[PDB]
Write a protein that holds these residues in place. Structure first.
Motif, PDB file in Angstrom:
ATOM      1  N   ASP A  27       0.905  -1.151   0.098  1.00 41.71           N
ATOM      2  CA  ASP A  27       0.022  -0.048   0.112  1.00 41.71           C
ATOM      3  C   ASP A  27       1.054   1.502  -0.139  1.00 41.71           C
ATOM      4  O   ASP A  27       0.572   2.192  -0.669  1.00 41.71           O
ATOM      5  CB  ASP A  27      -0.889  -0.061   1.150  1.00 41.71           C
ATOM      6  CG  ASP A  27      -2.107  -0.944   1.177  1.00 41.71           C
ATOM      7  OD1 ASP A  27      -2.514  -1.244  -0.162  1.00 41.71           O
ATOM      8  OD2 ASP A  27      -2.456  -1.583   2.025  1.00 41.71           O
ATOM      9  N   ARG A  28       1.957   1.426   0.655  1.00 40.07           N
ATOM     10  CA  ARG A  28       2.914   2.402   0.796  1.00 40.07           C
ATOM     11  C   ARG A  28       3.967   2.262  -0.075  1.00 40.07           C
ATOM     12  O   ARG A  28       4.293   1.075  -0.678  1.00 40.07           O
ATOM     13  CB  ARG A  28       3.299   2.621   2.199  1.00 40.07           C
ATOM     14  CG  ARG A  28       3.914   3.780   2.608  1.00 40.07           C
ATOM     15  CD  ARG A  28       3.720   4.059   3.963  1.00 40.07           C
ATOM     16  NE  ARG A  28       4.493   2.971   4.791  1.00 40.07           N
ATOM     17  CZ  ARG A  28       5.412   3.134   5.360  1.00 40.07           C
ATOM     18  NH1 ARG A  28       6.258   4.325   5.446  1.00 40.07           N
ATOM     19  NH2 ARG A  28       6.070   2.197   6.244  1.00 40.07           N
ATOM     20  N   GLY A  29       4.566   3.138  -0.457  1.00 39.52           N
ATOM     21  CA  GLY A  29       5.591   3.341  -1.484  1.00 39.52           C
ATOM     22  C   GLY A  29       6.835   3.434  -1.480  1.00 39.52           C
ATOM     23  O   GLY A  29       7.763   3.438  -2.340  1.00 39.52           O
ATOM     24  N   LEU A  30       7.427   3.929  -0.208  1.00 39.86           N
ATOM     25  CA  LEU A  30       8.757   4.098  -0.043  1.00 39.86           C
ATOM     26  C   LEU A  30       9.819   2.649  -0.016  1.00 39.86           C
ATOM     27  O   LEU A  30      10.873   2.963   0.525  1.00 39.86           O
ATOM     28  CB  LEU A  30       8.973   4.823   1.161  1.00 39.86           C
ATOM     29  CG  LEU A  30       8.974   6.374   0.877  1.00 39.86           C
ATOM     30  CD1 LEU A  30       9.189   6.942   2.274  1.00 39.86           C
ATOM     31  CD2 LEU A  30       9.689   6.903   0.088  1.00 39.86           C
ATOM     32  N   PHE A  44      -4.165  -3.495   4.296  1.00 40.82           N
ATOM     33  CA  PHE A  44      -3.462  -4.445   5.423  1.00 40.82           C
ATOM     34  C   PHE A  44      -2.205  -5.203   4.913  1.00 40.82           C
ATOM     35  O   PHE A  44      -1.871  -6.323   5.022  1.00 40.82           O
ATOM     36  CB  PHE A  44      -4.341  -5.771   5.717  1.00 40.82           C
ATOM     37  CG  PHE A  44      -5.105  -6.173   4.425  1.00 40.82           C
ATOM     38  CD1 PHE A  44      -4.369  -7.314   3.733  1.00 40.82           C
ATOM     39  CD2 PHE A  44      -6.508  -5.897   4.092  1.00 40.82           C
ATOM     40  CE1 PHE A  44      -5.040  -8.048   2.632  1.00 40.82           C
ATOM     41  CE2 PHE A  44      -7.039  -6.656   3.037  1.00 40.82           C
ATOM     42  CZ  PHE A  44      -6.213  -7.453   2.266  1.00 40.82           C
ATOM     43  N   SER A  45      -1.529  -4.266   4.144  1.00 43.12           N
ATOM     44  CA  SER A  45      -0.218  -4.967   3.433  1.00 43.12           C
ATOM     45  C   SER A  45       0.868  -5.062   4.419  1.00 43.12           C
ATOM     46  O   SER A  45       1.715  -6.003   4.628  1.00 43.12           O
ATOM     47  CB  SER A  45       0.088  -4.237   2.296  1.00 43.12           C
ATOM     48  OG  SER A  45      -0.740  -4.521   1.081  1.00 43.12           O
ATOM     49  N   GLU A  46       0.947  -3.880   5.561  1.00 42.03           N
ATOM     50  CA  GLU A  46       1.986  -4.115   6.504  1.00 42.03           C
ATOM     51  C   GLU A  46       1.482  -4.665   7.521  1.00 42.03           C
ATOM     52  O   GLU A  46       2.780  -5.079   8.450  1.00 42.03           O
ATOM     53  CB  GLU A  46       2.202  -2.472   6.921  1.00 42.03           C
ATOM     54  CG  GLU A  46       1.175  -1.600   7.647  1.00 42.03           C
ATOM     55  CD  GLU A  46       1.299  -1.705   8.794  1.00 42.03           C
ATOM     56  OE1 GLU A  46       2.242  -1.771   9.327  1.00 42.03           O
ATOM     57  OE2 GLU A  46       0.127  -1.332   9.582  1.00 42.03           O
ATOM     58  N   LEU A 101       0.679 -13.807   2.709  1.00 42.87           N
ATOM     59  CA  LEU A 101       0.601 -12.452   3.088  1.00 42.87           C
ATOM     60  C   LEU A 101       1.518 -11.865   4.298  1.00 42.87           C
ATOM     61  O   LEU A 101       2.231 -10.900   4.103  1.00 42.87           O
ATOM     62  CB  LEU A 101      -0.854 -11.951   3.736  1.00 42.87           C
ATOM     63  CG  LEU A 101      -2.374 -12.308   2.651  1.00 42.87           C
ATOM     64  CD1 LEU A 101      -3.256 -11.790   3.367  1.00 42.87           C
ATOM     65  CD2 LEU A 101      -1.734 -11.436   1.404  1.00 42.87           C
ATOM     66  N   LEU A 102       1.824 -12.688   5.039  1.00 41.67           N
ATOM     67  CA  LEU A 102       2.812 -12.427   6.029  1.00 41.67           C
ATOM     68  C   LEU A 102       4.301 -12.482   5.392  1.00 41.67           C
ATOM     69  O   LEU A 102       4.996 -11.495   5.953  1.00 41.67           O
ATOM     70  CB  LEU A 102       2.747 -13.499   7.345  1.00 41.67           C
ATOM     71  CG  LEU A 102       1.404 -13.752   8.023  1.00 41.67           C
ATOM     72  CD1 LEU A 102       1.707 -14.792   8.936  1.00 41.67           C
ATOM     73  CD2 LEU A 102       1.355 -12.386   8.837  1.00 41.67           C
ATOM     74  N   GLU A 103       4.658 -13.377   4.605  1.00 39.18           N
ATOM     75  CA  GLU A 103       5.858 -13.214   3.960  1.00 39.18           C
ATOM     76  C   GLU A 103       6.065 -12.049   3.090  1.00 39.18           C
ATOM     77  O   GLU A 103       6.999 -11.449   3.148  1.00 39.18           O
ATOM     78  CB  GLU A 103       6.178 -14.418   3.229  1.00 39.18           C
ATOM     79  CG  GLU A 103       6.464 -15.801   3.852  1.00 39.18           C
ATOM     80  CD  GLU A 103       7.723 -16.519   2.959  1.00 39.18           C
ATOM     81  OE1 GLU A 103       8.276 -16.043   2.514  1.00 39.18           O
ATOM     82  OE2 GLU A 103       7.481 -17.985   3.087  1.00 39.18           O
ATOM     83  N   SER A 104       4.954 -11.689   2.367  1.00 39.67           N
ATOM     84  CA  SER A 104       4.922 -10.256   1.673  1.00 39.67           C
ATOM     85  C   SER A 104       5.129  -9.140   2.646  1.00 39.67           C
ATOM     86  O   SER A 104       5.748  -8.345   2.046  1.00 39.67           O
ATOM     87  CB  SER A 104       3.721 -10.260   0.762  1.00 39.67           C
ATOM     88  OG  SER A 104       2.639  -9.915   1.249  1.00 39.67           O
ATOM     89  N   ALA A 105       4.545  -9.292   3.615  1.00 41.81           N
ATOM     90  CA  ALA A 105       4.573  -8.111   4.849  1.00 41.81           C
ATOM     91  C   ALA A 105       6.109  -7.899   5.165  1.00 41.81           C
ATOM     92  O   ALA A 105       6.702  -6.895   5.031  1.00 41.81           O
ATOM     93  CB  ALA A 105       3.860  -8.135   5.575  1.00 41.81           C
TER      94      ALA A 105
END
Lengths: 288, 50, 121, 41
Positions: A84-87, A140-142, A232-236
């Motif tokens: 969701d965020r881009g930094l 809920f990406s982070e 999802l957890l691994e990607s976070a």
């Protein structure tokens, strides 16, 4: 004149940017620790449900829709997991590269990609390319919860069982060793029946209430959901590691930019003093 | 130099009805260098014109 | 003489679009210098990739440069230059790597170097 | 305003790109499997 002013302005701008990026890198480090904790916390349930699914498949009718591949495969529902965020760095770009490789693999086999996205960055990337996003999930990406994974997996399995898809894929960033954030494509449906070996010889018989097939078909979508949640957890965790690396890179870049700008500003300062002295001495020598 | 440009450009005027009512519109052109609109002659001429 | 009345409408249009893409690429050099191309919009990422390819494709192996690199020089007709840069501005070579645009001549050299690197026009 | 709207009545303004990406290697697309212990390869 007015060149030293703009140089000092750019210097203080780059200093602000440097402070912000350093803070963001340390925050990303702390949150990487948190995300690794959540991952290793969700591990045990995954192991136990895998073992129970194996015990059930040992004595079940392996003809569940999620377990048999379909002749005439016309569509594969792909779930792209972005942030969701881009930094972060090339995190989303690597996800999109892997997803394009998967789409061009699916068009080679005659299947039509149906696209589900997680994250706003994938939303942007695919709306810019005039894609058709069947469903999107954001926010809920982070810190993803199991309820988000349950919703996603239920929607995907409903699309699979049905305006209908014949396969199901997930494109997400696998997190390994705190040093490997690697975009990967997995096939979650249909599953493939793999036979390892009898392993243990004659052993005790397992009782199943009411029977093995009911429990197997009740556990299969639960296993899909567990795998979606682990993805999802691994990607976070991968997104947080990418953000830490990208913020360290941006801090070093802002440092080098501050250094170069300060060199240019000192050159302009010396040049201004020399030029002013030249004008003063020119007037004084004209009057002498 | 300010007096040069200012007395050149102040002679562009809209005259009164008793003096005929004529006009002289002025378009001075100034070339800056490296977008430095805050040089000597540029800032001299910017403060003269309308 | 970079004017539609002297060089033509297509020449002028291609030149103006190249200049617009390169100017937009130059306006982003601070963001790209600190954060990279990963923070830009999709429009700006596309433009920055096209602009990198355009700025490498403006280079050329010159006949006077053979004394430095041993590589012979190339001549490109202006019609070929207009066509090639039109196709670059429209995005026909977005998949070709940044190299294979570097120090070449016309579109044939672009094709040859692209397939020597691993791509296809 | 009437003329402008009558003109907009008849005015005519001016799909996914290819991306020319090569197919993923099927060996690298992982497949979720059910590790059954029955002998039937």
């Amino acid at each position: 004149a007015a060149t030293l002013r703009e140089l000092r302005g750019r210097i203080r701008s780059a200093g602000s940017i440097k402070k912000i990026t350093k803070a963001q890198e340390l925050i990303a480090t702390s949150r990487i620790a948190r995300a690794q904790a959540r991952l290793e916390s969700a591990r045990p349930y995954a192991f136990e449900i895998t073992r129970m699914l194996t015990t059930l498949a040992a004595e079940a009718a392996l003809d569940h829709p999620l377990l048999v591949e379909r002749p005439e495969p016309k569509r594969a529902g792909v779930l792209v997991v972005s942030s969701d965020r881009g930094l972060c760095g090339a995190y989303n770009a690597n996800i999109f590269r892997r997803s394009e490789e998967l789409f061009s693999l699916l068009r080679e086999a005659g299947k039509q990609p149906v696209l589900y996205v997680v994250g706003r960055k994938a939303q942007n990337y695919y709306s810019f390319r005039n894609w058709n996003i069947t469903e999107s999930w954001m926010g809920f990406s982070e810190q993803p919860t199991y309820e988000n994974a349950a919703e996603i997996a239920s929607t995907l399995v409903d699309a699979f069982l049905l305006e209908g898809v014949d396969e199901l894929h997930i494109v997400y960033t696998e997190f390994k060793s705190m040093l490997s954030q690697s975009a990967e494509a997995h096939r979650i449906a249909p599953m493939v029946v793999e036979y390892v070996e009898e392993d243990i010889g004659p052993r005790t018989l397992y009782s199943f209430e009411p029977d093995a097939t009911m429990l197997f078909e009740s556990l299969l979508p639960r296993y899909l959901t567990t795998r979606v949640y682990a993805a999802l957890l691994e990607s976070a965790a991968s997104e947080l590691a990418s953000r830490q690396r990208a913020m360290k890179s941006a801090t070093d870049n802002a440092d080098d930019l501050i250094k170069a700008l300060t060199l240019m500003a000192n050159r302009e300062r010396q040049a201004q003093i020399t030029q002013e002295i030249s004008e003063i001495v020119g007037g004084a020598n004209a009057l002498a | 130099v300010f007096y040069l440009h200012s007395r050149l450009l102040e002679r562009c005027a809209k005259l009164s009805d008793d003096l005929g009512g004529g006009s002289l519109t002025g378009l001075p052109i100034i070339e800056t260098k490296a977008n430095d609109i805050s040089a000597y002659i540029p800032t001299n001429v910017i403060s003269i014109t309308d | 003489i970079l004017d539609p009345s002297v060089v033509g409408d297509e020449h002028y249009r291609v030149a103006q679009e190249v200049i617009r893409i390169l100017q937009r690429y130059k306006d982003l050099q601070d963001i790209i210098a600190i954060l990279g191309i990963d923070e830009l919009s999709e429009e700006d990422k596309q433009l920055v990739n096209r602009a990198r390819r355009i700025e490498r494709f403006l280079s050329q192996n010159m006949m006077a440069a053979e004394q430095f690199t041993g590589q012979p020089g190339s001549t490109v007709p202006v019609k070929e230059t207009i066509e090639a840069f039109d196709r670059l501005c429209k995005g026909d070579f977005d998949h070709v790597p940044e190299q294979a645009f570097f120090l070449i001549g016309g579109l044939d050299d672009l094709a040859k170097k692209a397939e020597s690197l691993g791509a296809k026009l | 305003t009437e003329v402008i709207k009558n003109f907009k009545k008849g005015f005519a303004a001016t799909v996914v790109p290819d991306e020319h990406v090569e197919a993923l290697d099927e060996d690298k697309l992982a497949k979720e499997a059910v590790k059954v212990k029955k002998p039937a390869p």
